[model samples]
Target: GSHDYLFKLLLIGDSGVGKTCVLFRFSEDAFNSTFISTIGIDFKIRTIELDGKRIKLQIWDTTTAYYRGAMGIMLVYDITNEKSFDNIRNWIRNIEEHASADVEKMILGNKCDVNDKRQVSKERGEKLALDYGIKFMETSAKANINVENAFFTLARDIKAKMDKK
Candidate 1:
């Protein structure tokens, strides 16, 4: 247990990829079925104690329209939707130009519960994560599956990197 650390994280991806839902589930532990476009950017924060330190995570859910302001980008895709997966490259490029060069990243394939409708395979997701030198996880917001853990895991990884400095 150390002191307190504040971290700023950003979510970026194609519109309607469930980024908002992921943020909602992580921050409020709730999910909604209706689809709504995030205007410009939306933010939420969650605090957790890690190793005795109060880690405050500032999560910015950026709209695909305003992909130029995200500092730390989380690339999210809907596993049941192939278009979302196919747009990963464009999201990455936008993040590279707008976010920090060393920004910690994770490739999130959301909605894993819809296996029957899954369009992207875990193998492909893992390969993309490996190729990009980042982490990858499949999550389901509705099922509350690995949703909170995803953000926490990223925070821990970032903290580890900071500790080495």
Candidate 2:
């Protein structure tokens, strides 16, 4: 259970943007379609191997040490919910004001499995991400698509930044 490095990560979004869904899916490999709103904050720990070293990730839910100590932050939005996607900039503003400037950031368009209901197109998501110069992905926690990739991408980016310092 030992780790070589510990990275504090944050997940933030609107009430029903599936922030918890992505967190649980990545950490526990579990998912539920039921909409549960995160009240305060919750967190999960997962140890993963990267570059032959154990990288411990502490992923916070709907969260906060969050703004101060976070090495990475993910802004999640529901693909089918245009309002959620439109709110991503506000979350990014919060991060810019609170979190460290060097913190790795990502934008996830969740619920990609529901393509028919998608109100936020992938190109739109990509354009927004490009505007902010943040990494972007379309994920489906229910379908187990790009869930692991999102976690790994952020972790690796943080690790790379840390190595440079």
Candidate 3:
């Protein structure tokens, strides 16, 4: 309940894209590679920090519970899985339909370390982000890549928007 800001950030994408794994890495500051069966249950909450302030991200397994306070959404898709990449649009649609109107959005392409096997390139991710008018970054939970910036970017942008208002 105390920080420079508090925003409900989301880790959303299709199943098996390492959404939970990424969350585990970012929230815990360590990557737990032992993938679970599926991120079960309806909701959960994890607090990450920026500049000594706390950013409480309430993770909802379902998009239905999109609340106003949860305005920064981190959309993730696996670069190795083309189908997962294609499904980004549907996820964005769900967030836009249910979340706050001016919600800050960021897109991430996971599995960025496996460039040899990547089905979605960085260009594609950037293009999609541009088309949707959101920020994009390539990341690998396996390599601990951009995991911090991805989350902190959302938190920072949320703070900027909040502070401006």
Candidate 4:
């Protein structure tokens, strides 16, 4: 079947950085401003047709603790919040320990819609991504900005790697 390419993706970030919101927006095309803490870990599945193959994306919306076992990690930080930006190093370190030697990753700077409160600059985020050898993207779940594209971009990258295996 075309859906055989099942990939497990893990989302890691500090609390209240919109990790869940990004998942919701991508899965349900909806957004909410309310702040709710994730218990331990949550999972969501979404299937998309890319390049004539059904790609099943198993997205694990995980808490900070789950980073210790993440495979494909998407480290999200809030562009409008400094605290979220400061936590990227911790997330990256966890990935280094838990993920495979060739684990795939992407660093996302979220909440780009709120430019008034933008704390993390794009240059800084890109520099971090370059330093860590991962893809970098900025998105806003509220405005439907690059939310879905980021997932697909990473998916394509992972799929390409798998195809070469």
For model 3, the superposed segments whose C-alpha errors exceed 4 Å read: 1-4, 33-54, 59-64
Those runs of model 4 whose alpha carbons end farther than 4 Å from true positions after fitting are 1-3, 33-41, 63-71
Report each candidate's C-alpha RMSD, comma-separated, in the order given.
3.6, 3.2, 3.1, 3.2
Worst 10 residues of 4 by lDDT: 62-71
Error of 2 at 143 (Å): 0.7
Instruction: Tell me how candidate 3 scores on lDDT.
Output: 0.78
How would you encode candidate 3's per-residue C-alpha lDDT over 59-111 as one tens digit per residue?
55434554556677778899999999999999888887888888888998998
**Candidate number achieving the greatest TM-score relative to the actual structure:** 2
TM-score, per-candidate, Cα-based: 0.86, 0.90, 0.82, 0.87
TM-score of 2: 0.90
User: Which of 1 and 2 is ahead in TM-score?
Assistant: 2
What are the per-residue Cα lDDT tens digits for candidate 2 across 67-129? 878888889999999999999999998888878878899999999999888899999999999
Worst window of 10 by summed lDDT in candidate 1: 63-72
- Model 2, residue 137: distance off in Å is 0.4
Error of 1 at 140 (Å): 0.7
Tens-digit lDDT track for model 4 on 8-126?
A: 88888998888988988888776863554334538788998778899888888853455544447789999988888889998888777767777788989999999988888999999
